[PDB]
């Protein structure tokens, strides 16, 4: 109906007994009561600090909230005990409510020492509070032993927010709560902890990935369980894996590029929980997270209409500071969002009318052109339900002196639509890497995407490495070849330690894949490390590949995270070489995320 979005604070730092409140968890009890849990950090720090698990309750659907009650109290006096990071799981079949959390003594996540002995004050224990009266009273259990099938699981904690209960297939009824372990090899993984007997016993399934962290799982329209993870390896995205079973295992983990994430927690739920398998309502997902990849801000709610393959809908609920966010389906049709606005924990309620709309994911290919040219690219739209929209619009988002126009024929129920985008870029347009936003305006809601228009740069798919002085390829992937893949996240690294290799006169050459008229080169520093940054450099070109001529350019580039230009008077060359003479802070290695050659295709 009319678009709804309201919010109020449940916890405000300093008031009501704690200097810090953090780590949100939202649930709706079997009888319509909203339950919100979070840490009360007397220390403002997580485990092993004396944190307490708290709870506020709303019986009128979320408008008014009760007093702040303690679910698990931490001991500030020695010996220090703490409880942290709550996560609710509601067994819709029996009525039991489970609040999972970290139980700390002397060690936190990174300090936990091997062992399952509840008594050993050196392991981060896995606790569960159970309640049979809708959350009023609780029963605590330490299940660290039930869930540590491998003596190597040195550490663990339950990912905050809220767990699930399968509805479909042969495991309908199973409860699932996600964890993050630290295996024997020091690696962080994702593991599903589940119960087939309504929580009396909890067993752990098969672990997944490397560089995982707080992860979330959801039931797809077909019983498949999608897993959406924070990436501890900081690639600015969410990793995802899928499972098709009940003794839980997921396939390979890959990165979702439609999910920009600053390496933070995120929420993903079924928009219509009780929809039947296969139906269109069972295919609708809601995901909340911080859209910024460099910051914990720009809280945006995204919608998927095909089990998470496409994410056309999106809206910002908090443009400002936004860290952890957790979602829940309300019995009235709306959704409850409990998050961290920086002031403590806030509660929000919104409905789908407020999100924008139309499940019409669309695609527009990436375009490469020369400055001063006009290019027309096709648009492909894939339409949903009550969608006979005779008049849809296409609003592109680019640079002011760029003429961009687009059109799409009408949308017909469950049909594919066509259209096209005409881009015109001026002759004084500086070389490559341009993001263009497209927005499908319709009277039934929004749908948006982004494509790339690269100007005056050669094709990396035609490039190869002619030579390199050293490549770190044992301890890590510092391959010379990671410079030509279109990914800032991957980098070439000089043979670093764990082998005392050569010092600074470092270099790399690219085989352009034929003779081109080139007039420049752009390089992006390695993004998440500052000691293998190139300072002084010199460029050399060649066309026979053996006799190099130059330097055609020389300079010292900066500490800039964006691409930096090495310009020179146009010339023909089949290969280009970058000689790095020094590192910005005098350290011994060179690392390059990406190399771009400016020229004519």
Q: Does residue 487 interact with Na ion by CB under 5 A? A: yes
Looking at beta carbons only, is 212 or 595 nearer to Na ion?
595
Q: Is 498 annotated as a binding residue?
A: no
Nearest distance from C-beta of residue 479 to Na ion, angstroms: 9
Asked if residue 373 binds Na ion (CB under 5 A), the reply is: no
Question: What positions carry a catalytic annotation?
Answer: 46, 214, 324
CB of 481 to Na ion, least distance (A): 9
Grouping H, G, I as helix, E, B as strand and the rest as coil, residue 462 is: helix
Instruction: Output the six-digit token pair for 410.
Output: 């009408």
Cα pseudo-dihedral 335, 341, 343, 349, rounded to 10: -20
Closest contact distance (angstroms) between CB of 491 and Na ion is: 5
Cα distances (Å, whole numbers) of residue 148 to 126, 180, 511: 10, 12, 51
Q: Kind and range of the H or E element at 57?
A: strand 52-58
DSSP sequence for 233-287: T--SEEEEEEE--SS--B---EEEEEEE-SS---EEEESSTTPPTTSSGGG-EEE
* DSSP codes of every residue in 525-587: --TT-SSS-B-EEEEEEESSSSS-EEEEEEEE--S-SS-EEEEEEEEEEEEEEEEE--BTTS-
Q: In this structure, are residues 143 and 127 in contact, taking their beta carbons and an 8 Å threshold?
A: yes
Instruction: Give the containing element (helix H, strand E) for 191.
Output: strand 188-195
> Is residue 490 within the footprint of Na ion (CB under 5 A)?
yes
**List 58, 87, 482, 542, residue binding Na ion (CB under 5 A):** 482
Q: Judged by CB, which is closer to Na ion: 63, or 462?
A: 462
CB-based burial, 180-189: b 16+ in 10 Å, e otherwise:
bbbbeeeebb
* Shortest separation between residue 28's beta carbon and Na ion, angstroms: 45
SS3 19: coil
Q: Residue 553, preceding bond cis, omega within 30 degrees?
A: no
524 binds Na ion (CB under 5 A): no
- Span from 145-153, 343-351, 479-487, 498-506 in contact with Na ion (CB under 5 A): 479-487
**Is the bond leading into 88 cis (omega within 30 degrees of zero)?**
no
**Beta carbon of residue 504, minimum distance to Na ion (angstroms, whole number):** 21
Instruction: Measure CA 14 to chain center.
Output: 31
Residue with Cβ nearer Na ion (364 or 480): 480
Please choose, out of 157-165, 274-282, 299-307, 486-494, the segment that lies near Na ion by the rule CB under 5 A: 486-494
Contact 282, 226 (CB under 8 A): no
Q: Which x/- pattern over 559-598 shows residues binding Na ion (rule: CB under 5 A)?
A: ----------------------------------xx----
**Count of residues in contact with Na ion, rule CB under 5 A:** 5
In angstroms, give the least distance from the CB of 563 to Na ion: 12
CB 68 within 8 A of CB 46: no
Interaction mask 435-474, Na ion, x per CB under 5 A = ----------------------------------------
* Token digits of residue 370: 């020369």
Q: Could you tell me whether strands 175-182 and 164-165 are parallel, antiparallel, or unpaired per DSSP bridges?
A: antiparallel
Pick between residue 219 and residue 532 the one whose CB is nearest to Na ion.
532
Report the half-sphere exposure of 280 (CA within 13 A, side-chain side).
6
- The C-alpha atoms of residue 313 and residue 362 are separated, in whole angstroms, by 11
Tell whether residue 230 is among the known ligand binding residues.
Answer: yes
3-state secondary structure of 61: coil
Residue 30 Cβ vs Na ion, minimum distance, rounded to whole Å: 50
- Asked if 424 interacts with Na ion (CB under 5 A), we say no
Residue among 245 and 477 whose Cβ is closer to Na ion: 477
CB-nearer residue toward Na ion: 404 or 458? 458
Specify which residues 80 forms β-bridges with. none
Least distance (Å) between residue 472 CB and Na ion: 14
Decide whether 439 or 481 has the Cβ nearer to Na ion: 481
CB nearer to Na ion: pick between 9 and 511: 511
Residue nearest to Na ion (CB): 490
Task: List the binding residues for substrate.
Answer: 22, 230
Task: List the binding residues.
Answer: 22, 230
The site for Na ion (CB under 5 A) is made up of: 482, 487, 490, 593-594
């Amino acid at each position: 109906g009319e678009p709804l979005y309201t919010e109020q604070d449940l916890a405000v730092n300093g008031r009501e007994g704690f200097p810090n409140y953090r780590i949100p968890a939202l649930t709706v009890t079997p009888d319509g009561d909203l339950l919100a849990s979070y840490d009360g950090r007397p220390t403002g720090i997580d485990a092993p600090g004396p944190n307490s698990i708290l709870q506020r309750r709303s019986t009128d659907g979320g408008r008014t909230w009760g007093e702040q009650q303690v679910v698990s109290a931490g001991q500030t006096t020695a010996p220090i005990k703490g409880f942290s990071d709550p996560s609710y799981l509601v067994d819709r079949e029996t009525g039991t409510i489970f609040n999972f959390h970290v139980y700390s003594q002397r060690q936190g996540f990174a300090g936990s020492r091997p062992g399952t002995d509840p008594a050993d004050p050196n392991v981060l224990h896995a606790n569960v509070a159970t309640s049979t009266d809708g959350g009023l009273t609780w029963s605590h259990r330490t299940i660290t032993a039930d869930i540590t099938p491998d003596p190597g699981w040195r550490s663990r904690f339950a990912a905050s927010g809220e767990g699930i209960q399968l509805r479909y297939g042969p495991h309908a009824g199973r409860l699932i709560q996600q964890y993050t372990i630290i295996n024997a090899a020091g690696a962080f993984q994702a593991v599903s902890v589940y119960s087939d007997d309504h929580g009396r016993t909890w067993r752990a399934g098969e672990a997944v990935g490397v560089g995982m962290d707080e992860n979330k799982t959801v039931e797809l329209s077909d019983g498949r369980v999608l897993l959406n993870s924070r990436d501890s390896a900081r690639s600015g995205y969410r990793k995802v894996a899928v499972s098709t079973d009940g003794g839980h295992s997921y396939g390979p983990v890959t990165i979702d590029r439609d999910l920009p994430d600053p390496t933070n927690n995120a929420s993903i739920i079924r928009a219509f929980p009780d929809a039947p398998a296969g139906s269109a309502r069972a295919k609708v997902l809601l995901f909340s997270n911080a859209a910024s990849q460099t910051s914990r801000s720009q809280g945006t709610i995204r919608m998927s209409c095909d089990d998470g393959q496409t994410w056309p809908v999106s809206k910002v609920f908090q443009p400002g500071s936004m860290s952890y966010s957790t979602l829940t389906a309300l019995p009235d049709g709306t959704y409850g969002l409990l998050y961290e606005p920086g002031t403590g924990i806030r509660y929000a309620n919104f409905n789908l009318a407020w999100l924008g709309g139309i499940c019409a994911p669309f695609t527009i290919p990436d375009v490469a052109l020369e400055p001063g040219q006009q290019v027309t690219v096709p648009v492909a739209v894939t339409n949903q339900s009550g969608i006979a929209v005779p008049k849809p619009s296409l609003q592109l988002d680019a640079s002011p002196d760029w003429q961009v126009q687009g059109s799409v024929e009408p949308l017909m129920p469950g049909r594919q639509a066509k259209g096209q985008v005409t881009i015109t870029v001026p002759a004084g347009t500086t070389p490559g890497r341009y993001r263009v936003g497209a927005t499908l305006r319709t009277s039934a809601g929004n749908a948006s995407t982004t494509f790339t228009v690269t100007v005056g740069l050669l094709d990396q798919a035609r490039m190869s490495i002619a030579d390199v002085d050293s490549e770190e390829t044992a301890r890590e992937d510092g391959r010379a070849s990671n410079v030509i893949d279109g990914n800032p996240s991957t980098f070439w690294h000089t043979e670093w330690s764990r082998a005392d290799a050569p010092g600074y006169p470092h270099r790399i050459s690219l085989d352009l894949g034929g003779t081109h008229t080139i007039s420049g080169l752009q390089y992006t520093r390695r993004q998440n490390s500052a000691n293998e940054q190139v300072a002084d450099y010199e460029i050399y070109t060649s066309l026979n590949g053996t006799t190099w001529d130059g330097p055609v350019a020389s300079g010292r580039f900066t500490t800039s995270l964006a691409p930096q230009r090495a310009v020179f008077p146009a010339r023909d060359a089949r290969y280009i070489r970058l000689v790095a003479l020094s590192e910005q802070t005098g350290h011994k290695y060179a690392a390059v995320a990406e190399l771009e050659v400016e020229g004519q295709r």
